[PDB]
Amino acid sequence: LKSDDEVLEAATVVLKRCGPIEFTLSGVAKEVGLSRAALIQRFTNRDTLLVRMMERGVEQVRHYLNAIPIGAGPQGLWEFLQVLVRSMNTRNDFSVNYLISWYELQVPELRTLAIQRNRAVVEGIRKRLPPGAPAAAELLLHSVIAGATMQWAVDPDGELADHVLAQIAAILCLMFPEHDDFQL
Amino acid sequence: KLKSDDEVLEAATVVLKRCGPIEFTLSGVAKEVGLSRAALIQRFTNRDTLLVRMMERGVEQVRHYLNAIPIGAGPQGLWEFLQVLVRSMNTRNDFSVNYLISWYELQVPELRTLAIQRNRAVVEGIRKRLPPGAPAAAELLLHSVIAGATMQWAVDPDGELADHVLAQIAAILCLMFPEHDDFQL
Numbered sequence: 001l002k003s004d005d006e007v008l009e010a011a012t013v014v015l016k017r018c019g020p021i022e023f024t025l026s027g028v029a030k031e032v033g034l035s036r037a038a039l040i041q042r043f044t045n046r047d048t049l050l051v052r053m054m055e056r057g058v059e060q061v062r063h064y065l066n067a068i069p070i071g072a073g074p075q076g077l078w079e080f081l082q083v084l085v086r087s088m089n090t091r092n093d094f095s096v097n098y099l100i101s102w103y104e105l106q107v108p109e110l111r112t113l114a115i116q117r118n119r120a121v122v123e124g125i126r127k128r129l130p131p132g133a134p135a136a137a138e139l140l141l142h143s144v145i146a147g148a149t150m151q152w153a154v155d156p157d158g159e160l161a162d163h164v165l166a167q168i169a170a171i172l173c174l175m176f177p178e179h180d181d182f183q184l
Numbered sequence: 185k186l187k188s189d190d191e192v193l194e195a196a197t198v199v200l201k202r203c204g205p206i207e208f209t210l211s212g213v214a215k216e217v218g219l220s221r222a223a224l225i226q227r228f229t230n231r232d233t234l235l236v237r238m239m240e241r242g243v244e245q246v247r248h249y250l251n252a253i254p255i256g257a258g259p260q261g262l263w264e265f266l267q268v269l270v271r272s273m274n275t276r277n278d279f280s281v282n283y284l285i286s287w288y289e290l291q292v293p294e295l296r297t298l299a300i301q302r303n304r305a306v307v308e309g310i311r312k313r314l315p316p317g318a319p320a321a322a323e324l325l326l327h328s329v330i331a332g333a334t335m336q337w338a339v340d341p342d343g344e345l346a347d348h349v350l351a352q353i354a355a356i357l358c359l360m361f362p363e364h365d366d367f368q369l
């Protein structure tokens with residue numbers, strides 16, 4: 001496997017499967033089909049590879065959110081938030097995200113990228129707000145996604161998206177009380 | 185004389201908040217409470233059993249704390265309760281340890297049940313304080329705002345935790361209770 005991008009994607013697979021503590025160059029090397037020495041020549045060491053991977057994360061969030069088609073009014077916002085929430089993968093071990101997030105906060109380089117990642121998502125929501133959205137509505141919507149996601153991770157009932165989006169629908173009704181119900 | 189079980193578990197919880205659940209050891213708790221490692225083994229068997237007892241005490245403390253918050257009336261009484269609840273989270277030391285504690289709980293079924301009980305106690309505590317005319321499932325939305333806004337702050341801190349979270353709580357309460365005044369801290 002050749003490109004920096006192909007290698008960083010394979011390393012991301014490993015990070016999701018093992019978490020950041022058990023993450024190793026050897027495990028990336030075995031995933032991507034390259035020698036560990038090759039990873040070292042291209043990315044210097046474990047810590048530096050983690051940084052490049054998380055840089056690619058923030059890039060991919062921005063790349064992803066920026067091209068999602070924009071619909072009109074509260075209904076467009078609702079559509080966007082559905083796509084956003086459904087984008088989260090719960091198929092293997094969702095709890096690894098909380099270990100990832102914790103680990104990121106301990107390493108200044110990763111912490112800055114984590115901030116950029118959340119800022120990108122908040123700004124992505126902000127740009128989909130129709131006129132008449134309450135002030136700072138983007139912060140509230142991102143909080144509901146993160147908080148309801150946590151609720152479900154601890155105490156799961158049904159699919160993540162259904163738990164989160166029910167709450168999103170509820171807050172959208174409060175933000176746009178003259179709109180028709182938001183269909184989930 | 186013997187130190188109480190509550191004193192020992194308190195000391196252990198301080199250690200857990202300092203080192204996190206991966207680095208938590210009997211030796212650390214012993215150093216913290218002035219007791220021998222041997223004495224801790226006698227009373228609490230092992231490190232895993234000690235963590236279960238600490239987390240059982242945690243759920244008890246949550247329930248006791250929520251019961252102790254004065255009960256007001258109306259949307260104002262709910263806002264007052266929420267202010268106390270949010271301000272109850274200690275930010276004296278490294279708040280990010282809470283995310284590790286949460287992750288670890290999810291890995292250990294006995295601890296995960298207790299984390300579920302904790303969140304359920306807080307959700308139910310909010311629910312019992314909802315005035316009539318709060319929207320359906322408002323207690324879940326309010327808990328989500330606290331959790332989500334706290335995580336936003338823990339990743340990207342601007343000022344005090346409570347200030348960041350309560351600005352959003354005030355915002356949603358305005359939406360829930362449009363016929364009410366602005367909610368002031």
Ligand SMILES: CC[C@H]1OC(=O)[C@H](C)[C@@H](O[C@H]2C[C@@](C)(OC)[C@@H](O)[C@H](C)O2)[C@H](C)[C@@H](O[C@@H]2O[C@H](C)C[C@H](N(C)C)[C@H]2O)[C@](C)(O)C[C@@H](C)C(=O)[C@H](C)[C@@H](O)[C@]1(C)O
Pocket residue numbers: 012015016057058060061064065084085087088089097098100101117118121142145146147149335
């Ligand atoms: C702690 C709990 C927090 O989770 C995380 O921070 C983990 C650690 C991220 O993965 C981190 C780390 C990592 C390696 O994925 C595990 C990386 O690939 C991503 C970009 O960021 C997640 C899952 C990201 O998902 C990514 O959302 C993109 C829009 C699409 C992408 N996917 C379709 C490709 C998906 O994975 C993303 C950006 O945070 C989702 C948005 C909705 C949020 O802001 C939500 C509210 C999160 O703050 C959160 C759930 O509260």
Ligand SMILES: CC[C@H]1OC(=O)[C@H](C)[C@@H](O[C@H]2C[C@@](C)(OC)[C@@H](O)[C@H](C)O2)[C@H](C)[C@@H](O[C@@H]2O[C@H](C)C[C@H](N(C)C)[C@H]2O)[C@](C)(O)C[C@@H](C)C(=O)[C@H](C)[C@@H](O)[C@]1(C)O
Pocket residue numbers: 150197200201242243245246249250269270272273274282283285286302303306327330331332334
């Ligand atoms: C991950 C992020 C989550 O944090 C935790 O789960 C950590 C791990 C708990 O500590 C865990 C673990 C531990 C050891 O503390 C770190 C234990 O002592 C407490 C009870 O539970 C926190 C902090 C608890 O604080 C406690 O709130 C009580 C009302 C009063 C109590 N204390 C001041 C009287 C205070 O500690 C408590 C209950 O979760 C606060 C309520 C508001 C929540 O439900 C919020 C929304 C959380 O779910 C959260 C912030 O999203």
Ligand SMILES: [Cl-]
Pocket residue numbers: 087088089
């Ligand atoms: Cl994902």
Ligand SMILES: [Cl-]
Pocket residue numbers: 272273274
């Ligand atoms: Cl606390």
